[PDB]
Each structure stands twice: as C-alpha cells, then as structure tokens.
From Swiss-Prot, chain A:
Record gene name: ATAD2
Subunit structure: Interacts with ESR1 and NCOA3 and these interactions are enhanced by estradiol. Interacts with acetylated lysine residues on histone H1.4, H2A, H2B and H3 (in vitro).
Record's subcellular location: Nucleus
Induction: Up-regulated in breast, uterus, colon, ovary, and stomach tumors. Induced in breast cancer cells overexpressing NCOA3 or treated with estrogen. Down-regulated in 5-fluorouracil-resistant derivatives of the colon cancer cell line HCT 116.
Residues of the full protein shown: 422 to 1389 of 1390
Name by which UniProt lists this protein: ATPase family AAA domain-containing protein 2
Function comment: May be a transcriptional coactivator of the nuclear receptor ESR1 required to induce the expression of a subset of estradiol target genes, such as CCND1, MYC and E2F1. May play a role in the recruitment or occupancy of CREBBP at some ESR1 target gene promoters. May be required for histone hyperacetylation. Involved in the estrogen-induced cell proliferation and cell cycle progression of breast cancer cells.
Family: Belongs to the AAA ATPase family.
Binding site for ATP: G46, P47, P48, G49, T50, G51, K52, T53
Tissue note: Highly expressed in estrogen receptor positive breast tumors and in osteosarcoma tumors.
The organism of origin for this protein: Homo sapiens
C-alpha cells in the first residue's frame, strides 16, 4: 500500500539506498564494467521507532510491480525459529535459492538475533548447528549475485560475531529519529474529513518534541478518540446508541491541545509565543550581521572566510544568553552545534576534563562546517584549571585558517573588563563584537495586545491605563517586563467568575500603579 | 568459527606492493622447510614458527596473511587456515576459554599443516580472570614440537600491551614493523588496483597522483579508485534514473571531486602533525621553507637521502606572528618524508591515554630510539616548559642523555621568545655557535607575486585595466609592516568584496569600493 509516498523526510537516505543496493541489482551488468564488487550484506540499524520493515516492504512493492526484473521475499529472523535440529536451516538455502530461481531479489531478515544468536556453551546444540551451518549457508551461497542480504535489528551487538567477517555481512544503514515532520503531517492525514489547518498541523509537529513516527500517528488517533469523548461525554453511563450523529466530532483548535496535554513527551530553542514579537527584530539583526562576517550561512565563486569569530556583549539582564543565543542557534539550523559549558565538562566522571575538550574540537573538525558554543565566557574562564586554558588555546589555534568553523560566545561584563587573554582573542577592529539594546516602543506596545484586550472580554479609560504601563516601561529589562506581564495576567484569572466589571479593572489599575521595581 | 574462509584466488602476492623484504624473509620460514625438506636436515636447523606484526591500522596487516594462505595452498593441498580475533566474547569469562584454545590447538595438530592467526592480541594476554588464560596459552605454544608444522601469526596495533614472557625465541621470536608506504610504494599500489582497466592512465599522471597523495594507507587508495568510477558513471548518464555501455569512461575533474567528498585516514585517527603548505600561501613562504632545509643538513646529514651525526638539534626562533609554529614547522616535517615522527604536546600528554604523563614520554622516547632515524617534535617550548611539574622535567632531561652518542634522532622545536629570554635550563640544550639556531623573518617581489593573480586576473574573469596597476602599487606600499596573519587577511577581505559583486557585469561600480576599502582597513 506504500510506494515511496508514505515516507517523510528521507530525501537523502533513499538516494543512497537505491544507488548502492537496488540499482546494482536493478542493473547488474553495469558494475561488470569497472569491478566495483558491491557488498553482499546490508543492514538497517538505529534507535527504535524508525520504521525499518516498512522500507523493505516498499522495496518489495517497487521491485515486484513491473516486469519482475528484481524480486523480494519478506522473512523474519525471529519467527523463523524451529525447535528442531536443522529444520529452520533449510529455510535460508531454499530461500536463497527460491529468490535465486526467480532472481534478482532482496531478502529481508527481521531480528536475526533469534535465528542466529551468539552460539556459546549455554545455547542449544540445535541453535549451535543452526548458526554454524547458517553462516555457512550465506557466505557460501553468495558472492556472485543477485541476492543482497538486508536485515534489521535494534542492537548491533545482538549478532553472532562470526557473521560479521570479511566477505560476509558488511553494510549498515543508519536510521535516526524535524523536516521530516511536515511531510509526516501531510501524509498521515491524507483522508480526513475534519482536515486540520496547515498551521494547525505545523504547530502539532512543533509541540510533538521527542516523538518518532509511530507516536505521531498515535497522538492523532488519541485526539480523535478524546474528541469523541469531549463532544459526547454521555458515552459513559448510557444505554445503547439511540441518536448520535458522528459528524460533530470535528477537530478544532483546542481539541488537539487538550489531547497533547494528557501524556508525557540541544542549546537551541526558538522564542515562546509570548516572546517572539519582542526579540524577533534583534534575532534577525544578529543573523544579518553573522551573514556579513560568516559567508557560509585557486578558484573563486566559492565562499571563504578567515577564522569566523563573534561575541555577544550586553549589560546583565539583557537576555544575551538567556533568550538570544539559543534562538540564533535554532535559526542557524542544518549546522552541527557543539557546546562547551561546565555541566558538560564536569558532569561526567571516569574521564579527565582535558579528555573531552579534545574530542569535541576533533569531531567538529570532522564535520565542517560546525558550531562550537561557549556560553558565559566571563565566568567560564575563572573556573577551569591552569592546564585547561592552555589546552583550549592550542586546540583553537591548530585550526586551518580557511576552515569555516564558527566560535560563538556570550558575555555579561563589557568587553573592556574581561581578562586580557580573552581580549587578545577577539578583533573588535573587525566585525567580531555585537551589542544588544533595549526593545523599542512598538515592541513594548505590541507586547500587551493579547491581554489588553482580546481575552478579558471573552465570556474606554483602560486605554489610558495601557499607555501609563508603557509610560513607565521605557527602561526596564527583559526580566522585569516578563514578570510584570505575569503579575498582571494573574489578576485576569483572579476574577474569571465575576461578570461585574469596573471592580477587576480597578484592581488591575491599582496594582500597576503599585508595581515598584526601582 | 574454525572453518577456513573461502579466499579469492586473485590475491596471490600480486596485490601487495612495496612489501618485499618482509616477504623475502617470510617465505624462508614457512615454505622452504616444506618445499626443500632436505636442506633443513643437512646438519640441523629447525626453522622458527612464529612472528608478530605491529603498526598503525590500515597498512595491509591482514592482506599479506590472506595472500600467504592462498599462495601456500598450491602444491601441498590443503594448507589449513584458522582465523580468530582477540577479545571476542571470550575474555573476562572462565573457564570455557582455555577449553576453546585447547580444542583449537588439538584440531590444528590434527590437520597438519595449518596457519593460526590471532588478531588483536592486545585484549587477550594483557601486560585469575586473565592469568589463567595467558598461562595456558603460553604452555600450549611451548608444547608445540619444533618442526610443527604449526605457524602462529599474531597481529596488533600497539606493541606495548603484550606479555614480556611471550617475546622469547620459541614463541614469538621475530618481529615485523608495518609502517606507512612511501611515494614509490604508493605508486605501486595505484598500479596494482588499476590493472584491469582499458583506459590505462599515463605514467606521468601516475607520478603526479602519487605526489598528490600523502598520509594515505591502502584503504584510502581503494576508496578513491572505487568512487571516482561512480563519479564518472553518475556524470555520464543522468537521464536513466535498457542502458548503453558505450561512453561511461573516466577522465580528469573526476579524481579531484572525489578528493573533495571525504577526509583521509590520517585526519581521522592517526592525527599526523605534518601538513602540506597551502597553495594560496605557497609563493610567500616556499623560499623560506627551502632555506631551512638547506641549514638542516649541517647538523642532520641523513636528510640528503658512513653518515656520522652528533646529537642533531634545531630550533627556529622568530617574532610572535611570523608563522613559525603555524605554517613553517608542519611543512618542514612534511618535506622530510620516510622519517617517522612522534609528537610530545599538551593534548597528547594529558587528554589521550589518561595515565601519569610520566609514562607516554618514556614510551615515545624509547620507540623513537628503536627505529632510528626519526624526528621528535615538541612545539611551543616556551609554553610547554611552564605547564609540567618538576618530575617530568627531570625525566625528560635525563632521557635525552641515555641515547647513544651517534644515534640519528633529531629534536625539532619552535619558539616565540628570543633565545636569551627562554629559561636557562632550556637554554642549556642549544649551542648556536654549532649552528642549531635559526632566525626567521618576513620582500616586495614575494608579496607582489602573492597579489597580482588576485587583483589582475581573478578580477578580470568593461574593465579599465589601467588603474589596477596603481591600486596594486598603493596596497603593496601600504603592506610594508604587516605580519603573516594580517597579510593573509587582506587577501580574504578583497576577494569577498569581489564575491559580493558576482553578477555586476560593469566592473567600474566596484573599483571605487576597493579604492575606499583599503584606506578604511587598519592593522
Ligand atoms: N518512523 C516510523 N514511521 C512510521 N511508522 C512507524 C515508525 N516507527 C514505528 N512505526 C510504526 O510503529 C510500529 C512499531 O515499529 P517496530 O515494532 O517495527 O519497531 P521496533 O521498535 O524496532 O520493534 P520490533 O523490532 O520489536 O518490531 C511499526 O510497525 C509501524 O507501524
Ligand atoms: N598495501 C596494500 N595494497 C592493497 N590494499 C591494501 C593495502 N593495505 C591496505 N589495503 C586495504 O586495506 C584493507 C585491509 O586492511 P587491514 O590490513 O585489515 O587493516 P587492519 O588489519 O588494521 O584492519 C583491505 O581491504 C585492502 O583493500
């Protein structure tokens, strides 16, 4: 039922899997020209929840539909278990021949852990002969095509070590657990009478942090199930269905949100729904400046730079590391990010801090371009020992000059107050230091539109009130603004069940005048 | 898994390149007793029956073993082959392991002949979970009769982690070092893996290919040769994604794009310190690099290959920013190929191999003394000296006296402070009147050469072609006192101004841009 249309996000995995597995089986005479000798053993491995067997079934559909030029047999290495001496043994030679009498073919082996476990002194002589003669079945009945052994498992070490030898089972395909999620939401709701809004589904996928595929459909089914709970609360404690129209179970804005809150669900995090219209301008500005310094976000017509470096400096309480920098990291996605802070350096024992400080830089060198994050450099410099500072400096210096790896750091004290070793590390004469500024008047004006007023009247003079709140908030930092918002929004809850107005507005207007934060 | 592995008949000593002295000595231990059974009984010989392979991974450690197994099994069918890998769900678990080893040796004696191959012994017999296994292993290996006919072959990546009771003649008597191949062996490997190809590349093409590949080991060559073909195939037929096998041949521009898409094995785990001087900066420092190697032959006359040398030392001193320890030193290390290098730096003493820093220093000193000639490399000595405790300073200073006088071990060091500034103990190692101290410096011509094919040609890919010369003179005059980091920055700030004007077909709206930028640029 799936022909590469119920798969979301896997734009690059498909190209690799088809080119090195199916195409050599789809076009075997081509590789006779150069003698590539493609491997005869392939695997699907990764964390659970990646949907490994469905890909094999899709390959079966692709190969079977047509002229039957390449085939596929579906097999499981966990239901192929026979409690007899050698009866499950014939399954592979017949299968490696049944798929060979009608070759080419791809044979899937789900959970080979049971059919071919680790033969040992505790395992049955049955399974001992099974595994021995079984590896004899595969390494002997291969090496000329056109059978490519594809298997799946949850753990890589759950395989008999004699299987993974030269000239035997070799290849491994990494399946991992957000760009896939838009495609997933598009696909899995292909036939829905209450078709949700595209922004509705995008918010759904945004709020489904940590889910991998199956639970993505599970939440949708659960949302429908609780929709018929909420629209029809009388389903409990009622007689047989007498009059129920099964069309008012339509999913609206609040249905999935009440559905999401009924189960438990990196230094990059976008702003909240309340914070976005306050710092979005500054995030865009810093992104633009970074574009200017860092062009990656002999021969010409190729981007090049000289040691990408940048420092965020702002007065404490300006949210330069509390809200800005993780947001910038989130905005500059599709690049590897690697932090270096105290709980990641001292948070693991059985290792010297020097032992991990080299691994991050080495592996970020491997995957250039990469991002290294060092928050609160003004305090991180005074916690490490004398050797760590020197090791950090030498590791940073050993980078190539034209390597497009960016150093991102944030600070609280002004640049002129830092230790001198930091000072002769940034080039303020260049574009390497960015300043954070207080929000302007429009942002503060638009920060209070929702509560004043789009929900208070939900079942004048307050406008003067409104401007007074702004008339005092010219020079308050982010934390004071947000705490003020929370304290005002509390009173709105305080009189939910008071239809009579002019008494709640009195208490709001007297609390705002009473709010002293000098 | 005691069954022999069905090896291909295509590996018959014709797929091994540059390993000739090793094969020339291996065949007189295995083959000759069997093929000349009368000459070993002329008087008495009893040839040996065991050898160790040690060295970095990826140097054809197993390929020679498979080739030996196949080539031997030709006139004495069948020579048995047994393949076991160390640390394979068998260690740290007793007492099944001794039963397994005894069974393997019994069946091997039953076969007669056989070749037993223990791979990665480092995890089997470490330097009564572990005592009982090593004891029975060595008792069994001593219980082998002299004529055998059992030959035991061990492989490892580090020699330091083996029992000292095994390296005795009678168990593991002869040791073999498998180092990286040099340029000649690299060309030989290229010729071997490109044998069944009808568009045979030219010899000069192979020479330049061999020169363009440094720090590579066997598998890198295989991957590059196997993926350049896929690059050509991908480029030829993009409409097929019946097929025509007529024009899928490989050409240039396919080898270099192949070079782009992965990293060498040396940048993965080996982490070699020597790194080739960049093509952008080459015409700025090539003369200096050639000059240093000229002054290196005064003290270490092995570099021009009864060569007698006495304590070869060298130290290149300069200003903080002249690129001593950033560009020059890895280049000089690079040009001295065929000499093994061992590194002594902060990341190596401390991060890797978390034991006392007192151990790795002794290990690298002894290993360097064992395989002379070699280079011991300790850069940034004015910072290295002030991080270590007095114990390691004493250890290091005393280990440099135990080398024999005429042993060819070169010490390479770099520094930023002037000679008289360094602490007096370090000063009591370099004897400048002997010629052990080099001073580095920053000409008009060399930077002129650095600039013209950026400010003339790359900016000409309507053009005035007159004020470019004046701009070149102005900027060159302006750059009379910058250091290397600054000088290589102006190149990156002008080319970016060019990139920002990619589609500007009029090359006049940008001229004033540079004629203002170079005056708004400051050191
Ligand atoms: N990434 C995914 N995309 C789509 N459907 C998925 C995904 N992951 C899981 N599913 C669905 O949930 C089911 C559970 O997956 P499955 O049990 O095969 O994986 P597993 O956790 O490795 O377990 P096991 O190997 O024991 O079967 C799948 O059969 C499929 O219906
Ligand atoms: N000299 C060589 N000639 C041809 N191939 C080589 C050579 N050295 C290494 N290889 C490649 O390396 C692989 C074997 O590496 P191996 O010697 O097993 O390294 P290790 O023993 O450290 O795993 C082979 O697949 C082969 O293609």
């Amino acid at each position: 039922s799936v022909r590469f249309d119920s798969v979301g996000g896997l734009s690059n995995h498909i190209a690799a899997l088809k080119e090195m597995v199916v195409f050599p089986l789809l076009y075997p005479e081509v590789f006779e020209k150069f003698k590539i000798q493609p491997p005869r053993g392939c695997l699907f491995y990764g964390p659970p929840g990646t949907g490994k067997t469905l890909v094999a079934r899709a390959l079966a559909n692709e190969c079977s539909q047509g002229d039957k030029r390449v085939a596929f047999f579906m097999r499981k290495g966990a239901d192929c278990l026979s409690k007899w001496v050698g009866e499950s043994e014939r399954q592979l030679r017949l299968l490696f021949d049944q798929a060979y009498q009608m070759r080419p073919s791809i044979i899937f082996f789900d959970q080979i852990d049971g059919l071919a476990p680790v033969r040992s002194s505790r395992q049955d002589q049955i399974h001992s002969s099974i595994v021995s003669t079984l590896l004899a079945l595969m390494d002997g009945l291969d090496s000329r095509g056109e059978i490519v052994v594809i298997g799946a498992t949850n753990r890589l070490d759950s395989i008999d070590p004699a299987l993974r030898r030269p000239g035997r089972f070799d290849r491994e395909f990494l399946f991992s657990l957000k760009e896939a999620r838009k495609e997933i939401l598009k696909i899995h709701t292909r036939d829905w009478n209450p078709k949700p809004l595209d922004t509705f589904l995008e918010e759904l996928a945004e709020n489904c942090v940590g889910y991998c595929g199956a639970d993505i459909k599970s939440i949708c089914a659960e949302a429908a199930l609780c929709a018929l709970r909420r629209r029809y609360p009388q389903i409990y404690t009622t007689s047989e269905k007498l009059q129920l129209d099964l069309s008012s179970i339509n999913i609206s804005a609040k249905d999935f949100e009440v559905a999401m809150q009924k189960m438990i669900p990196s230094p990059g995090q976008a702003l909240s729904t309340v914070v976005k219209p306050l710092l979005q301008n500054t995030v865009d500005k810093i992104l633009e400046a970074l574009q200017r310094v860092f062009p990656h976000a002999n021969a010409c017509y190729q981007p090049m730079s000289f040691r990408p470096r940048i420092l965020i400096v702002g007065e404490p309480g300006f949210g330069q590391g509390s809200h800005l920098a993780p947001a910038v990291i989130h905005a500059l996605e599709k690049f590897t990010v690697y932090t270096l802070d105290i709980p990641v350096l001292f948070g693991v024992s059985t290792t010297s801090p020097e032992e991990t400080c080299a691994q991050v830089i080495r592996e970020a060198k491997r995957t250039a371009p990469s991002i290294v994050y060092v928050p609160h450099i003004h305090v991180w410099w005074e916690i490490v020992g004398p050797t760590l500072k020197a090791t950090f400096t030498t590791l940073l210096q050993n980078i190539p000059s034209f390597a497009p790896v960016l150093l991102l750091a944030t600070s609280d004290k002004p640049h002129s107050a830092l230790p001198e070793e930091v000072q002769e590390l940034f080039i303020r004469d260049y574009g390497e230091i960015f300043n954070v500024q207080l929000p302007d008047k429009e942002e503060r004006t638009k920060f209070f539109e929702d509560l004043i007023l789009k929900q208070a009247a939900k079942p004048e003079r307050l406008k003067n009130l409104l401007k007074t709140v702004v008339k005092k908030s010219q020079n308050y930092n982010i934390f004071q603004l947000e705490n003020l918002y929370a304290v005002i929004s509390q009173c709105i809850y305080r009189h939910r069940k008071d239809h009579d107005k002019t008494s709640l507005i009195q208490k709001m207007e007297q609390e705002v005048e009473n709010f002293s934060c000098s």
